[PDB]
Amino acid sequence: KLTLPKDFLWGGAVAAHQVEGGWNKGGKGPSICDVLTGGAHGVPREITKEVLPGKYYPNHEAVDFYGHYKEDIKLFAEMGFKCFRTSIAWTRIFPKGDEAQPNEEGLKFYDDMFDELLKYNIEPVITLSHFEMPLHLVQQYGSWTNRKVVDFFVRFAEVVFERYKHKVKYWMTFNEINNQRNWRAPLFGYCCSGVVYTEHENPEETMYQVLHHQFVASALAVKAARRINPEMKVGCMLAMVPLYPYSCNPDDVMFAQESMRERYVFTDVQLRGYYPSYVLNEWERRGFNIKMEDGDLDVLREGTCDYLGFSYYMTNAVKAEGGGSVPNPYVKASDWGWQIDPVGLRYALCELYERYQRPLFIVENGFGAYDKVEEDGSINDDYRIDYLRAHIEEMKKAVTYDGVDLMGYTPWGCIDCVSFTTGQYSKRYGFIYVNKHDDGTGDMSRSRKKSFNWYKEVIASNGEKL
Amino acid sequence: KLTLPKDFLWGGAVAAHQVEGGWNKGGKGPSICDVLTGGAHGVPREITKEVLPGKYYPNHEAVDFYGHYKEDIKLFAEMGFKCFRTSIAWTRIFPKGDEAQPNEEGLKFYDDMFDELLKYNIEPVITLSHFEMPLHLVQQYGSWTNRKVVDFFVRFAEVVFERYKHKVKYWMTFNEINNQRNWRAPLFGYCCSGVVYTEHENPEETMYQVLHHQFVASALAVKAARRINPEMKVGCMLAMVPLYPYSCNPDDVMFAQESMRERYVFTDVQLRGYYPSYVLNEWERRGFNIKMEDGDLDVLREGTCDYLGFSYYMTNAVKAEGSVPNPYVKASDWGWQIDPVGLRYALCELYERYQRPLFIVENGFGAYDKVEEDGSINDDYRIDYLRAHIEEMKKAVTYDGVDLMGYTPWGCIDCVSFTTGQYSKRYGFIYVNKHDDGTGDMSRSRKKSFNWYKEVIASNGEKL
Ligand SMILES: [Br-]
Ligand SMILES: [Br-]
Ligand SMILES: [Br-]
Ligand SMILES: [Br-]
Ligand SMILES: [Br-]
Ligand SMILES: [Br-]
Ligand SMILES: [Br-]
Ligand SMILES: [Br-]
Ligand SMILES: [Br-]
Ligand SMILES: [Br-]
């Protein structure tokens, strides 16, 4: 029969600010999430002006990957990871973002991390910006609204490409860059770009300006990496939630088609190297005015990403008249309402590959669920195994049947991490359980869930034994 | 205030074999359609070994565009056509297909037609192969299944490319090349490529072999046109029936996505320049062996088409052919579902996929026409259809930002139908007095849609 490529990149994914902790160790400056309080169901996270002693900030400690990384990596090697995806904490390299020189201690930290990873033959996959820019850049410059932040990010990228030019083969620029396309939401704009759009006179115009600065920063980074070491691959990162039309009503089919542009505009620019006519038309209609410098458009054409990294978790259904979507009655969903749609993965893979004809990378996938530690210490997470297995099956299909070019697969929060929306521990994704809880209890120790040995066998059989 | 481009190519579209007549005049040899009998509802058209006396062949006479072209064109100009789409009858240039020299008479005929068109500032849009290849190539060489036909087709393209290099700006290689992807249907394979696939031991493998030859031929033709006059645009021609997932069931959605590849594989090759991985995978699955020659893949990459010409009439909904009636749309009396939004959808999908200029080379409403006592034909129904479609078309261009060259409604002058070869199913703004029973005098007259469309062009789409 046919199987995945022998060198398929099976691994695991996390983000610095979601696991590391040590938020103020080694000279690291505060990031936008270090002033983001923990939340819960019905209780949103709060942005504070500074770190308030009375408040709870879950990213400060997270799961202490900063201290446990050597041992955690030994666990990754036990599962047999071919690669590991995390981010380089921007604030560990430029604590404020505008320093004349980088923070040496930060650079050493990641030298050590990548060394361990390579010791076990684990290829680092690094996201340059993953919801954790320096607070100072937001407070002093107005964040990505300011062209200067472009320069700051490029300096950051330049320093790290060179430092780890022989240690890191795979890069991505801006994590889930399209989350913020939803500009009414309280935290997509903030975590993406340190900008809350509804707090501006022209929220949408402000959005497109930030996007432009980031597209240009991404393109400038690609070129930088090419000059430093053209063997390295730098991809974009798209949060891929496919939108099904609820029915075969032409209005529904057409609404979904136009709505998918909220995703595609980002890859269109980052992969094709220019603003697609459909977005330029919108700017006209809305009378937006996006400040560009001479050369920007050239920069975009010359610095398109090399591969399409994306996260997949779920699918949505949309109606032309109604809502801003509606639950798909043909699929089940997690305890947090995230729809379970493995076929949607094959759909996303086929759609993305047919549109761009460039290599794809599934850099996020996983099932957020509660875990119960049994009397004997085991954690039976068959619910998570069922999810991942169904997705891997569909993923395999898109590769061996549909002919999609797929680089690899890295399930999200491969070790339990602080959640994004609520900053809780209780919503778990990991193969490795971390003893840390919402009320602050726990000793931070690790233990293997049932999904641990299962995913081990997955990689050993190159995805043939599920 | 936004509108279509000032130079939008409004026009009309027909096919040589469906309008011309004079099937054996001017040295013209018999085509595959010259042996295709007329039919009707529940009575399939028949292919005969040769021209049989007691048999009816609608394409022999058609509507006599051969004799009426000058006067017909005058009617085109009256509506104010910016362009006119037709095909060059392969058999008027190479009557049997394998002649070393072209038929001068055939060439002069199109010099005359093109001269008339250009007399009225009408830009010819010429389809090289439109369901009318030389019978002889089919009988003697086994048609497109034979590699020799590639060179025959290219010889043909080269002759006409050179002859009209200062008269024709817009070409297309193969008309609705994807119709034959439905290898079971009795006519698509035969009309597209003179091959009935079910009559072969490996229908599908035979099909992909035919397609490879035509993909190469198309590319070779594009390369040939570039050398002759790089200002000429050579496009492809896809029959576009969007497939909607019946419901948001992931299985319907996925099924629809994969099914659309039956369209996209053709434009993928002709526009992107190579065989998409998904079809190459199907071949390995099925064990097919498509015979290729060194440089073929090079040819495909070098001779991609400039623009995507396509036809649109309808959409289908699919459930995991797998079709099911779409409960949200109406249909013509011939079952063709009416879905103007589908056009906009087709334009956006095609454009977002290839980012190449599009060209709506066919769109129409086939229906009965009644002549009123005073000679007038009230075809409100046809106008209704055309208007709804033009409106969504305008949205795709001015709202969505699709790059669109023009728009030429099908059978702009009444023509012989494809499926049945009848006159009764009319598409035109111009009525032709000729009927299924053979009665009529071939005279032309204007339908209500004549002046309506006349105003569409004058207002560049702003007065509908
Ligand atoms: Br505060
Ligand atoms: Br400094
Ligand atoms: Br907990
Ligand atoms: Br013969
Ligand atoms: Br048929
Ligand atoms: Br077969
Ligand atoms: Br080759
Ligand atoms: Br189909
Ligand atoms: Br509009
Ligand atoms: Br009739």
Residue numbers in the entry:
A (entry chain C): 5 to 327, 337 to 479
B (entry chain D): 5 to 324, 336 to 479
Sentences from the paper on this structure:
In all, we determined 23 structures, four of them not deposited in the protein data bank. These novel structures represent enzymes involved in stress response, specifically methylglyoxal reductase (YghZ), as well as three enzymes important in core metabolic functions, phosphoglucose isomerase (pGI), 6-phospho-beta-glucosidase (BglA), and glutamate dehydrogenase (GDH). All the proteins are oligomeric (YghZ, pGI, BglA, GDH) and belong to three different fold families. YghZ and BglA have a classic TIM barrel structure, pGI adopts an alpha/beta fold, and GDH possesses a core Rossmann fold found in many nucleotide binding proteins. Based on these experiments, we demonstrate successful structural characterization of multiple proteins using only microgram quantities of purified material.
